[PDB]
Point group: D2
Chain length 496, copies 4
Amino acid sequence: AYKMESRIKDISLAEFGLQDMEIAKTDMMGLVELQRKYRDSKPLKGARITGSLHLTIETSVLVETLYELGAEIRWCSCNIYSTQDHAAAALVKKNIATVFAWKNETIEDYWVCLNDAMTWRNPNDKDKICGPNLIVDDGGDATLILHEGVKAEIEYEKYNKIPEYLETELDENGKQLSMDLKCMYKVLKMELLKNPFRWRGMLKDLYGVSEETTTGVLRLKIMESEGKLLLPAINVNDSVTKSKFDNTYGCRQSLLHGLFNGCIQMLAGKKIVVLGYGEVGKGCAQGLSGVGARVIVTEIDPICALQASMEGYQVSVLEDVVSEADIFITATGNKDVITVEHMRKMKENAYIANIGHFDDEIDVYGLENYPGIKVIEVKQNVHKFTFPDTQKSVILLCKGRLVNLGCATGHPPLVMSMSFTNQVLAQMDLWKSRELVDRSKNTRFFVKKLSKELDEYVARLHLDVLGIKLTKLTETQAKYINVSINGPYKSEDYRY
Amino acid sequence: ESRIKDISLAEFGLQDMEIAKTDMMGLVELQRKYRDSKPLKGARITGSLHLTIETSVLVETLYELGAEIRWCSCNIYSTQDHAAAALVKKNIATVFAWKNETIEDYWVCLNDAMTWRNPNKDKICGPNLIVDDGGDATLILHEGVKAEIEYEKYNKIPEYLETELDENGKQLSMDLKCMYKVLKMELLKNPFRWRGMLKDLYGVSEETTTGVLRLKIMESEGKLLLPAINVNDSVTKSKFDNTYGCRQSLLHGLFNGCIQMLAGKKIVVLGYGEVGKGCAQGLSGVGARVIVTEIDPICALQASMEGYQVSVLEDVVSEADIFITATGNKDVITVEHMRKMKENAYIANIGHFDDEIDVYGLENYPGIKVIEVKQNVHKFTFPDTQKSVILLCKGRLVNLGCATGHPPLVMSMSFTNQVLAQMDLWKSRELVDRSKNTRFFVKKLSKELDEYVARLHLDVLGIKLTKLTETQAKYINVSINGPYKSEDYRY
Amino acid sequence: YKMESRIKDISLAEFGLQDMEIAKTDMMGLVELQRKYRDSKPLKGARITGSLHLTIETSVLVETLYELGAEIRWCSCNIYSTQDHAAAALVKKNIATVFAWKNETIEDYWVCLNDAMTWRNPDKICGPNLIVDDGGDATLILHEGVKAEIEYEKYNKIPEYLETELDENGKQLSMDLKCMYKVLKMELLKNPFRWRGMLKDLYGVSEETTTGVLRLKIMESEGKLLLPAINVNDSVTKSKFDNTYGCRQSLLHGLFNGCIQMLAGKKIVVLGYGEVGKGCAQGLSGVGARVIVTEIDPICALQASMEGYQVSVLEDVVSEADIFITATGNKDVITVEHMRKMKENAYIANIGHFDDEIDVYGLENYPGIKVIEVKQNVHKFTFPDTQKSVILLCKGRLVNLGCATGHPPLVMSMSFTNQVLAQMDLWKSRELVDRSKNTRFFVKKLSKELDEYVARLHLDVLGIKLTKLTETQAKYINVSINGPYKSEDYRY
Amino acid sequence: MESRIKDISLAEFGLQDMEIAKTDMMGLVELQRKYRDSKPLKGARITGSLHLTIETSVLVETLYELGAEIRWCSCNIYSTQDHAAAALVKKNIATVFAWKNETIEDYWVCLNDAMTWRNPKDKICGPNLIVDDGGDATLILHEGVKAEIEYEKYNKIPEYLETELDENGKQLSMDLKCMYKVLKMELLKNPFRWRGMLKDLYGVSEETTTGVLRLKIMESEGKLLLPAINVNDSVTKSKFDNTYGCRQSLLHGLFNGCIQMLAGKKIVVLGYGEVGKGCAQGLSGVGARVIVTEIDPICALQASMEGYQVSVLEDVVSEADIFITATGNKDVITVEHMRKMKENAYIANIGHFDDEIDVYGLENYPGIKVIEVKQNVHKFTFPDTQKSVILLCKGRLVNLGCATGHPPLVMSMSFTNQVLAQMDLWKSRELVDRSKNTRFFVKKLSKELDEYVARLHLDVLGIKLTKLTETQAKYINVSINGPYKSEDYRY
Ligand SMILES: NC(=O)c1ccc[n+]([C@@H]2O[C@H](COP(=O)([O-])OP(=O)(O)OC[C@H]3O[C@@H](n4cnc5c(N)ncnc54)[C@H](O)[C@@H]3O)[C@@H](O)[C@H]2O)c1
Ligand SMILES: Nc1ncnc2c1ncn2C[C@@H](O)[C@@H](O)C(=O)O
Ligand SMILES: [Cl-]
Ligand SMILES: [Cl-]
Ligand SMILES: [Cl-]
Ligand SMILES: [Cl-]
């Protein structure tokens, strides 16, 4: 059953994925504990969960946890390069989930996989389609195809024809559409022809989405402020045990791993530009400095810029260092931070990489389609581009996709367990509150965060991994600082 | 009227103020922008905050903006006498502060700073605004009001003021007994003093974590008697002063009071909050092996991610070499702990109050011998083991007691927030209705102002900020001019 | 070259050639040596045999020797360290005859080394004129070969020690010795004057690493060294850069590829705090690990402490630590008994030259041990009695080259510029080697002038601007404006 | 009393600091314990010229317990700790000629007096052994001999002792004029003084890089007049004192003399040798952005490998905030450089002599204005630009002039080498034959002793060494007890 419907690269890798999962679980104590405590009561029993999140070994442990808790699951990855084929195979082999994911997907396949992951067959038999009850999302793509799908269906009935914005390769402004929008639109058009009630029909059983990353949260907030959010949402990124660990310490290690795999050069002594000094940029700079690089930071936020200066880093505008720096790393979550014009001024064999969620940070399309550009494959997912007029070259890591997952295996299990423990608690919260979702009276939906009590609990579940011994307050001390002995220990606005 | 150690020290203080101002851009800019319009014109401001060179620049700023000023320090050891002299010499403020005050004189200085006179018939008023660090000015006001209400309740001095024991049986701290002694003295002179100050009080802007805690407790109990602004929780304060300020000033305090090498030593940092994080970073920067204690599992994990062992004090007390309390809590290092420490272990506190260390218990231990090693450094020897521990400045904040506190740059960021806070409180004075509400709250400054403080300090360090294009601003959903982050952003 | 080389796949050549060109952006010492000496050819006609990890960095070294006039035969000095695309690039361009591939058996390793040492003159066999050695295996086979020939002639039979699985005490010989011995036995049957015959034309060996230098010094002290030697490891621009900063980066690369776990907050034991250990520790702390050092040398131990690292004996932390990295160059540093006390899924790896640091043989042969392959060159071992497991990276072979790609080009260029200079020195003095009279050879090092020159060649890579002394300043500190700037005993 | 010190009443404070210091100075404590009964230096007359700090007072005490008679002076006008000097005199441990803030004239008079011993009746002798730091004691001896020979050759005072201008005619340093004034006086008083000392002089042990260079120059020219031991190049000295000592004591000096925050500042470290490496590490540890200058391409690459920009001073003199000289060279910061610096740039030197900075040129610049900011910190303002620079302690080693120098642990390592070096020279005295050979050399202590010094300090830091098995010892070809490294090993 699961093996026939799933689409993965190679089931024979299952045994290696299972063995890696067991090793990873030594450190993923949060997920191990949730399984231990809830596998028998099954709090998610009956829930249909669709996930769009990098299908790595760490993610396979998250999926296993959701399955042990009672959920039926369909999964896909949220990046064309981030899937670990042995991880995917492990899930299918054990019948833990129906999977549509493989490393090195085409953009078209990415959107077909996501769409298939959102498709559930009616538990009341026959050719009837349903949607998921809950969504685990990373970057907002599952949430995007749902909202855009609803928008397309309304537009479709209004003029009783395929909306023309779906049949054009051009933007409202005039420029060409990203390959991602063209592929999503192609899937949506196809669905308008199969069943133009598919998307609105899913709303009936949709109880929520838990969003993993900064960029996904930004998308959610924009929908919320415009009154367009169609389901309840939990912002997992902003849990303290997520944003202050995964984003920073995870990147401190996995950026280095991606660079070491993709870039042959020594980092020590090099001028390395980290564009953006937020949670991710802070971790990146720390790792880079740790191996002797001279980090130069760019920022638009005066506070973050001052923080960088306090760690001994030069803070400059890209234009003043573009011809002198050796390596450029984008960590902004923004777009057009490195343009083709910037790339033409870089020194011979400068390296460029992106660690933000989307490739838009770097003008990869402009680079690849520059007239007379010459490209060679240096190794898998590493390309050297040579301009025709100057004959100078730049080297780009994995077509500007998130380098730690494209050119390496992503963050290690410990921090992913902290982020994923938050995901499981978020999913449990949304599922338990499903009766409060009434699609007739209650039309307006919101984004919330998990409580500080749960945030502290996530941390407690990982202390033993590191042999950390926590101090206990006496009654006198607890009263003196005005906190309960069991916490929470900090006010809501505390920044850690 | 001022009470300071020596006015002849003024020229050194004035000279130090000018040098410091090179990096205190925020204060220099507020003086340039507002010395003519004078947004604080006529406000009576009482400050209770370490009177350092950095603080004298803050005082000069409030003065140039139009305020009348009375000032005292919030610690018996933190005043820099040359800074105090500079303010009196220039007649910028009336000062009651000196280095090495007795606890009795501390509370007399505070009480005098809160008293305003001249033909206003010819009697006592209170301040309009308070700049507070640790909450002592705010405490004496609230405890004063409480004392006056108890006084009229039974037409006699409240008995809790005339005892040496607390609501339990233990000795009251010397600070508490000296405050009560002042309140009793004021009930006899004028039992309407404290409540009389309320009609003119428009707010307090609180500098530190411990003072904010005090304010939040009063707020949750509905006992806050004036509007308050929490300056500690501005991003440009808590994430810079508390962290990077301590990273440098802790080391300075340790170098001045502890003769030993920090490299290789096991140094226990108790508390890994904003202060503790800065402390650990500076200690490691000079080769120490930092060991952390924490009650908060999130903070404990953060310490572990920086490569530090996280342990309970009882497991490392007999092996570690130096102990630094940074908790804002009480009884973190007890006399029983000190009796198990190795020979010549060093003990210091960087939290706001001395209560973190059981100094009273140590000083009153039967047969204890004490020797003064240098100014404000004492070696205590237990008579049974003959072992000694060395305590820096009687457990008072070591960076201000054994050194000169944080450097100008981070203080300018903290103090630019203070000036903006005072301006907010003063401009809104007409909104304070006493006869009606009597329900006050603690608020913070906006992110717009927080970002502004940072902008004012970028040129000091040659930082070049990038400008978003319209397309980029739209993409990340922010205005080109900020704010650039959501309210819950943690930096 | 294609006709005789033994490599994995010639088709990988173009990837090797592209990587070499990218690498050359930073290997400016080798680039400058080629520019300056490709016409004069200071090594013209020299037959050079190399036994050194055949990486992309090594390919640039080999290309440099070739442009300088040498004929070359090469093999790797570890079964796991060859980069197949690097090997293919050399063969494809006809730069060298190569006997190397990633994942050789120990049998193939020794056969490859023997082939690299065999030069034909078309008929008769010859040896190399010069040897580039890393760890001393090429030097070892020569000396053991000579010893085997002498033993063979006095008793007129194959020496008994070459025909047994055991040493003099009844203990099992290492696989490396058995395989070396089987090669020497074969050569005695083909030509019992092979090894001795090579001495005539041998002018020297330049040794890359600490462990190999130890081997040379022992031979020198016993009066058994059969050729001049240059110790490259102890050039300042080698030992203070490659060994420390190279490992700071490549240890981490090796751990990231082989060990799935997060390094931050883990107790990571670095056994040995010499030039390698210092670099390992710095890299590990750089990513948040809590480093614990073991040492036998009180000076090195004190240095670790000054950097904030706990210094303990292995027995006191073996049950609590998470990861163990051996960087000693010694043996039996991690025994089977230590491994039986480790926590579940503890990781073990070696960064020293030889696998001897960890008792891999005892672990693999432990009665009832269960072994599972986690990924290429990473194995999980489970003890039958406790049911606890340990995870060994690349069977105890140097982890930065076995599980990753070794040091990056910049530091290798510095080490390799020294190697080329050493080779030139030995070849230029070939006429002064007298086999008849002076049969006593020594180990020497390159001059401080050449050492400073190596550093000068790499300054522009990192945009370093060097200050120039005024004539008055030069007098004051008593140095020449052009150096050397430091005493011979200066430790940098 | 024959001794000349600031104040004997400070002795008690000095004695208590010595006892606290001893907790970490294990090497000196162990030498006292082991050799005080047998007294291996009994009868030796030792003259020391080395910064008279609390740490140095423990070295002197050690030589004294070992049987030596002692006379001492400091090797810098600002480095003496008066309580340390007082402690030695109070206990009769040594005759001392030292105080903090000496004039240059008094410095040379103190050194000359330290070199003068009485003959047991009314005549003088010299020392048997010299402990030197920077080579001034060694310098006055050789220049003394040279002046006596020159005096007898032409039956008059050598005119170079009365010129005021040097051989080139560019004005002698104040240090040279004062030394020459002493030598002129001693020629008129006893023209055989210096040569008469050679008889009983058995050696000098030199502490620092600059002093060793001076020894090496004399050795190479065949002019060295006594055996010498290079203590600086022991591994347990140069790799610990010079690097980790400065990492901490540079910061202490800067925090005391410079009010500004180091974080984010561009700080230039000129010279990246043993001292510079430690300075850079300390500065980075508190958030500074370190920029290095170097003449040695190897040292330059090392700096780059730690992430530091490496530039020539001319390319950064106008943008940098603070300048620290650690070269041991001269004229690395000229008056012309200082004129290009930004407003309130700070300048300091941590090398042995003040020559690294052109202090004479600055102080004598026509129309320069100078103000004392605090004790030993001066702000110089140029008349044409009205820009100012702030110089710490007139260019003298900042860690000892503006602070208390290195801490006890590393000084104990350096001083344990000194005692062993003194014991070596003393035990070899019969090999010094004036009539027979007359060519002397510089040597170093053995690696066995170098390792012993390290072993003596392991327990201070809780270090647990591993012991080699017999198989392992044979495998790496070393004795179980060491030494563990070849002679050329660089650590
Ligand atoms: N203040 C202290 O407590 C203390 C302690 C130890 C040594 N020292 C003194 O510090 C000085 C340096 O000692 P060290 O042991 O580091 O010597 P070192 O030889 O190890 O380092 C000096 C470095 O300065 C560099 N240099 C020389 N001239 C230069 C110039 N014009 N510009 C840039 N760089 C230049 C050299 O290349 C060298 O690397 C000496 O005078 C020594 O006596 C002082
Ligand atoms: N506390 C101190 N007492 C005596 N001398 C000190 C001290 N600190 C530095 N030096 C100078 C030493 O570093 C010396 O070894 C040197 O080389 O200058
Ligand atoms: Cl007290
Ligand atoms: Cl107003
Ligand atoms: Cl012999
Ligand atoms: Cl094997």
